[PDB]
């Protein structure tokens, strides 16, 4: 059984908890595992690390999303999406990458099950928005000072 598949899906819920509690996602995760018969501890632990990929710079991630929001707000409307968005980008570069287009879809497909399917359309599209912004946010490496 692809236990890892579940560990990844649960990632969003952790981020979702931040919207309500906004505290150490590590402790919060412990609360849900209790209700959700995750069982496969491997998955629960693996899941934790997965969400951390998002937390490696959560705030910056929002910023990363904002640069492409063309001014809009990641909060848009749907709540899940807002949190889910961070989890999707977590992969982008934070986790290196690896089939980014498909990576979001699965994650986004997960949203269809939880959050409205219509939101999934926006979730995937907006996810790619960060990708384009990344290539631009790459780096320019300015000169030490030259002044020569």
């Amino acid at each position: 059984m692809r236990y890892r598949k579940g560990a990844r899906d649960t990632a969003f819920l952790v981020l979702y908890r931040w919207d309500l509690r906004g505290e150490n996602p590590g402790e919060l995760f412990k609360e849900v595992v209790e209700e959700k018969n995750i069982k496969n501890k491997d998955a629960y632990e693996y899941a934790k690390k997965l969400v951390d990929t998002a937390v490696r710079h959560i705030e910056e991630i929002d910023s990363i999303i904002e640069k492409h929001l063309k001014g809009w707000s990641i909060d848009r409307l749907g709540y899940v999406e807002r949190n889910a968005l961070r989890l999707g980008v977590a992969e982008l570069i934070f986790l290196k990458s690896k089939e980014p287009g498909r990576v979001f879809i699965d994650i986004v497909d997960l949203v269809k099950k939880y959050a409205d399917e219509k939101a999934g359309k926006f979730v995937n599209g907006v996810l790619s928005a960060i990708y384009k912004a990344y290539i631009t946010s790459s780096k320019e490496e300015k000169p030490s000072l030259k002044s020569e």
Side-chain angles (χ1 to χ4, degrees):
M1 299 183 150
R2 317 193 193 205
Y3 71 82
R4 44 178 294 181
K5 193 87 85 201
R8 192 171 292 181
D9 169 296
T10 54
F12 110 79
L13 98 80
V14 213
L15 246 43
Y16 194 101
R17 251 66 227 165
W18 165 285
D19 292 75
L20 276 59
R21 207 102 308 159
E23 290 180 353
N24 190 278
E27 231 185 358
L28 278 149
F29 217 144
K30 192 180 166 184
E31 185 166 293
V32 47
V33 232
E34 321 221 321
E35 276 51 84
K36 254 179 170 193
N37 299 331
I38 298 301
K39 287 272 155 36
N40 287 195
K41 183 163 172 47
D42 314 56
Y44 161 52
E45 192 174 331
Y46 185 101
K48 177 257 181 173
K49 193 206 90 200
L50 212 304
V51 69
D52 287 56
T53 302
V55 188
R56 183 167 173 192
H57 221 334
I58 171 163
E59 280 167 62
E60 175 165 89
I61 305 195
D62 313 348
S63 205
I64 278 170
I65 231 305
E66 204 196 61
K67 287 190 88 83
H68 209 293
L69 278 182
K70 283 172 187 188
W72 312 334
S73 200
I74 147 166
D75 62 49
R76 180 155 275 293
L77 280 154
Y79 235 124
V80 186
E81 337 309 338
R82 167 150 148 63
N83 337 146
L85 256 69
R86 286 94 90 74
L87 117 82
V89 43
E91 292 68 52
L92 234 315
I93 321 104
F94 314 71
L95 203 52
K96 199 175 284 88
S97 283
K98 207 85 88 180
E99 316 306 84
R102 254 279 277 271
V103 134
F104 320 128
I105 273 270
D106 201 67
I107 276 300
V108 186
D109 197 36
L110 114 71
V111 124
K112 300 188 180 174
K113 227 285 271 284
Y114 259 89
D116 194 305
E117 43 170 47
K118 189 178 84 174
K121 281 163 61 163
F122 173 86
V123 183
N124 81 71
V126 91
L127 227 298
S128 307
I130 280 183
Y131 170 87
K132 174 165 170 63
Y134 175 63
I135 101 75
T136 44
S137 184
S138 162
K139 182 62 155 287
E140 288 286 305
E141 195 73 84
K142 272 182 268 62
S144 172
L145 246 163
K146 280 275 268 39
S147 171
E148 284 177 34

